[PDB]
Design a binder for this molecule. Structure first.
Ligand SMILES: Nc1nc2c(ncn2[C@@H]2O[C@H](COP(=O)(O)OP(=O)(O)OP(=O)(O)O)[C@@H](O)[C@H]2O)c(=O)[nH]1
Ligand SMILES: [Mg+2]
Lengths: 159, 177
């Protein structure tokens, strides 16, 4: 089951095993029907590795694909306080307006968590959306803003 | 060539509770809620105004006043053209802290316009920072002061127009005749 092999290896930060699963025909967007239709990219988020997320995106992962609760990679990274993954997903066109089946978006979650860094990334990405919609002085470099933030919060419930 | 003729970044700073977000909402949407929702990290509004035949786009940043909920300081100040420094005329502490906010500007910005704002000037019985004392201070710093009420919509439009004209003037004073 190459999809399942990819799914497991993504949590485990194991890029060779991920690659092997892909070589055997794993769907990079495989959904695990036994585990809430979660995906390799959602497993990469839960595992905490930025490079595993990058690898999946480079190999065609849908940055927005949701689990059965309507939660995508950006939702999960926000909940776990994975600031670096939030930054990556925002730069890769993740839909931050998406709400899960309970009606929550990433910004509402970050605000409730009083997470200054993640709220800042989400709001500055929205500012870029608004600047673009009216159509660099017009373009916030959110990587630069991320670069001196903590990549995660180990005191949060995560790996 | 862009949609606007000029683009400026304005930054609102000052102690938590003084009315930063409320001033921004009054200017941006002409509303005042009465409720307090603590700003986490940063918020913003983008608004345009027309001045002497030119469209000026204002990117107005609103900082968290509480250190616990601020992000990296350089993120707020980078690219700023004008800083709006707010205190609460009913809070002596917020006015004492203005010099700390002015220091923060100086540690992060080479050359910006500034304006001082004494907000919540709508309850004489609780006012503790007297008008004359605030103007005297503002004068010594070489910065203009507006006493405002986001709640009653007093001097908010005037304050934002002033810092807009200051930043426009600073830009144009550097361009050709
Ligand atoms: N009476 C009066 N109350 C005001 C005025 N402006 C804001 N307030 C109230 O003051 C409280 C704080 O307002 P905010 O605008 O959220 O203050 P802030 O500076 O953004 O606070 P932080 O986000 O924590 O830094 C709220 O309860 C507002 O309704 C005003 O002009 N007059
Ligand atoms: Mg606020």
């Amino acid at each position: 089951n190459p999809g399942l092999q990819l799914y497991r290896a993504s949590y485990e930060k194991n890029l060779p095993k991920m690659a092997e699963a892909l070589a055997h025909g794993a769907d990079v967007n495989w959904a695990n029907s036994e585990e809430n239709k979660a995906t390799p990219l959602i497993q990469a988020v839960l595992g905490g590795s930025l490079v595993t997320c990058e690898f999946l995106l480079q190999n065609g992962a849908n940055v927005n694909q949701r689990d059965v609760q309507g939660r995508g990679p950006l939702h999960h990274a926000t909940v776990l306080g994975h600031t670096g993954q939030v930054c990556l997903f925002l730069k890769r066109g993740a839909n931050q307006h998406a709400t899960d089946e309970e009606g929550k978006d990433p910004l509402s979650i970050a605000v409730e968590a009083a997470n200054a860094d993640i709220v800042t990334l989400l709001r500055l990405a929205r500012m870029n959306e608004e600047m673009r919609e009216s159509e660099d002085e017009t373009y916030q470099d959110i990587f630069r803003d991320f670069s001196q933030m903590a990549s995660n919060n180990p005191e949060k419930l995560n790996r | 060539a862009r949609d606007y003729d000029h683009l400026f970044k304005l930054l609102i700073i000052g102690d938590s509770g003084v009315g930063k977000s409320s001033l921004l909402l009054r200017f941006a949407d002409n509303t005042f809620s009465g409720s307090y929702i603590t700003t986490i990290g940063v918020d913003f509004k983008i608004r345009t105004v027309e001045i002497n035949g030119e469209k000026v786009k204002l990117q107005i940043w609103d900082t968290a006043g509480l250190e616990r909920f601020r992000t990296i300081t350089s993120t707020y100040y980078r690219g700023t053209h004008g800083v709006i420094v707010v205190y609460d005329v009913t809070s002596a502490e917020s006015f004492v802290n203005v010099k700390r906010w002015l220091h923060e500007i100086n540690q992060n910005c080479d050359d910006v316009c500034r304006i001082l704002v004494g907000n919540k000037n709508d309850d004489p019985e609780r006012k503790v920072v007297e008008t004359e004392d605030a103007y005297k201070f503002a004068g010594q710093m070489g910065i203009q002061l507006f006493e405002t009420s986001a709640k009653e919509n007093v001097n908010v439009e005037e304050m934002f127009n002033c810092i807009t004209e200051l930043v426009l003037r600073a830009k144009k004073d550097n361009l050709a005749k």
